[PDB]
Design a protein around this ligand. Sequence first.
Ligand SMILES: Nc1ccn([C@H]2C[C@H](O)[C@@H](COP(=O)(O)OP(=O)(O)OP(=O)(O)O)O2)c(=O)n1
Ligand SMILES: [Mg+2]
Ligand SMILES: [Mg+2]
Lengths: 395, 547
Amino acid sequence: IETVPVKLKPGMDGPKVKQWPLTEEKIKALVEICTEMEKEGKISKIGPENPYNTPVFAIKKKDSTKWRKLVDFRELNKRTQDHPAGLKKKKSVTVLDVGDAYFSVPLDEDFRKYTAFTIPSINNETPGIRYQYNVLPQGWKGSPAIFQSSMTKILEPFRKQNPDIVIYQYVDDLYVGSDLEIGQHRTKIEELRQHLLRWGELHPDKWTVQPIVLPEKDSWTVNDIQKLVGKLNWASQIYPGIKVRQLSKLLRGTKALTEVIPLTEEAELELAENREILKEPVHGVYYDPSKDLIAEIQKQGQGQWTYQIYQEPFKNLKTGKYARMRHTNDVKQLTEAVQKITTESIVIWGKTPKFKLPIQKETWETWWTEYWQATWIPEWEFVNTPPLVKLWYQL
Amino acid sequence: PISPIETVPVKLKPGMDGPKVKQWPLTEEKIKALVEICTEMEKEGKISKIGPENPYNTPVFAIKKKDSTKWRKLVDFRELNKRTQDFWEVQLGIPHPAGLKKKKSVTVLDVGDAYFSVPLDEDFRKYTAFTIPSIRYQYNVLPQGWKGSPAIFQSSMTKILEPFRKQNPDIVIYQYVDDLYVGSDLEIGQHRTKIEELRQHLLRWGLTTPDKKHQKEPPFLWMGYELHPDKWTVQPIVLPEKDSWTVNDICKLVGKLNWASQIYPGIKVRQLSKLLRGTKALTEVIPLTEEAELELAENREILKEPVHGVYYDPSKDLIAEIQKQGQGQWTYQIYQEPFKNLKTGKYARMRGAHTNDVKQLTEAVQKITTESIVIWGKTPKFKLPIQKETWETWWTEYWQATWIPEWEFVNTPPLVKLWYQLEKEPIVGAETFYVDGAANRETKLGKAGYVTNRGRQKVVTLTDTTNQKTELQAIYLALQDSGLEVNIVTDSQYALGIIQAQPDQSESELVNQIIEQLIKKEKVYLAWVPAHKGIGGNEQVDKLVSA
DNA sequence: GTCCCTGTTCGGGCGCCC
DNA sequence: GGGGGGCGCCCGAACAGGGACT
Ligand SMILES: Nc1ccn([C@H]2C[C@H](O)[C@@H](COP(=O)(O)OP(=O)(O)OP(=O)(O)O)O2)c(=O)n1
Ligand SMILES: [Mg+2]
Ligand SMILES: [Mg+2]
């Protein structure tokens, strides 16, 4: 088949990211997967005169005897030349991995060199083994694009036959929502997979926001109120309606932290007012597809994680909470969090967020691939957060 | 002979042209050596004489080789290298004897004149023009001084070995440039037959294997080690002994010890390492500190004793044990059977202006894990001098995600501990201090001070300071003037973030003094409040320190 | 905006291997 | 004396970001 020419963004050069060390398990898998891909003409061996590189690793689904290869194409995607509102409302949504579909389309010869990657060896027994792609690579943003036309053709009948079903794709992923019973949904999914075979679970209606909420108690110490005023002072950035004037007034003087303060009539009111302001939703937040979704996550402790998505500060598109059983592995939990938040954002806006991760770069890089199960990878950066904001979203 | 392998196409960077560079003057002894080498290569088709139709040129010299009875022709291609395209290096690291498995039969081979067996691209040959003066040539093979040569050689060597590896999946070939360690589970006779097969295979591809460099019996010399059948050792290390030390000599001593720490436990180099903190040139002499002087002897003593590593049994677990050396210095041993080290090492990086021993221990674990993954491709089990409870406290309290993989406590002091603990709730019957700082950006003058619920107030004037500093000074002063239990309220995110992280060491004299106080105290509680919102009595103290 | 502090990255010197 | 690539180690420059202040 003839190939679509593909460009880099102008003034931009191909990726040059160093491969990280892999475990024996992942390397054995990769070497296995790669030799087959080489037989099927899908990838070719290349030299070091190709100066590009993109990291590669591998993930093992659940309890299975099958590894999926996974190329970190985040950089390449950034450098590569350049949504169903109903889907977030289905009672059930299944995610299928239709990446295989891509290996059937060839890839622009003049582009192949940017898809170079390297298999490492245990103990550097040998130099890296370098490959490049000859077909459309999973994980590359160019892949759904080129293949979109053929993707519509596969589906148009299934859609005609099932007009109540919404099918969405994000790179290697097919998101499929229905309003059916389970079993009816599942049997319907097996239908699409069988329909897909001839060509060659989520519950977005139990997604919940985590509101800001204020302590309720019968006696207040100076400390209780000092915390309260500070938390409200910050919240008043997210809701201009909040006020901490009356409550401040009680902190007139210079008093012992454990002194109890009887709440005045006004202060009792301002407090009631504020409780209500927090219930009334964030006015004026318009999703902009020309800007990046930022995600912040705060570790709350004891398996509780809180998160917010916004493109501009204090202008949250969403704010959430993430609960987990209270041998807890913080790093495992955080990457399970990041995966679930990315999933939501793909569904709600069909785009991945930039994460600000509350962890040390090296801790995270040492371990996150042990817990990854997605076919995509969000951009991210690392932050040592003000322990101020942790108390703000505290439940 | 020259490999019949395909060349690897290379090119200059765009807009660039080959190197024109005068051949600096050589010693006679070397010119004699070079024509000896050149007349030989030229017969062998490895270099070609050029005419005037070649504009370019690049210097050339020769250093004796390691045996020191033969010479190595080198070319200072520093300039050509600036103008040659980029390569992606394919050599990802360095094989380590501790990652080798026990083999029934072992061999070590070198290739004879390795680079000069691999053909260089035709179109790129002109740029290699050089001149032997007493006759001027270009290269037809890879030269030793070009930045293309290592990756091209390493990659070619890998292509050449692929067929053999495919055919002999169970013979293990550690390939380091042209060095080959070949191991098998065969009896010596059958192994030797396989080695002949390997050698003929390399010969058909143009790579000779001189018997001089063919090891057949142990101990094998390989990558700077000696490999005996059940143990390995590093080749003897020799530290300098000057009575006057320069930066260069120091750096040369640091390196040699770092290298040593892979199998000699206990090595430390902090005292040495700081010496070169300000020093701005290799030439600069430096006086040893009594501290550093003291280190060297400790190390110098460590080396005197005999040590070895063992090979890796994959059917047994990997264990790593960490010890604390004080000063942000850590040592580890990786083993499978006790008192039989696989290898050793040290961690000593200081990440952060402020930190404590639990963070540093977490950084050690991360480092050893990454390193274990490279060498054995799996994580070790840990044995750490930290109580399970200590870790849990830290993990609970800490606001970052943090984690150590499977591990077990080992009561080998000095144990790692948190040195103080902020109260989660305000302390009843503890004086409340409202601290604050202000500083003038222009004049650089400041004030730190507090106000207490018991009527006390104090203000201290500072010089050459910063807002952040005044804010830290205010906290210090309140710790200084308070009893063993104090409640402190600050409006400084900066200060609260530092202290709340429970550091026990800091680059900062001030934070060190603060840390000192915090440890002396029975109970401390740090509250934050937002500034300039008239909150009492952050309000009253803010008034005092601003003038 | 500026100044301050703290983090990352990248480029030096050395070590070791070929 | 004058070269190359890899990994390691330390160090100091140049950033990048956030808070606090004019
Ligand atoms: N200081 C060095 C040492 C080696 N090499 C390269 C070029 C060599 O060809 C190759 C392998 O090194 P050897 O010491 O084995 O040297 P040769 O294989 O060139 O020669 P010999 O026949 O003496 O082994 O690594 C280099 O560029 N610089
Ligand atoms: Mg050789
Ligand atoms: Mg102030």
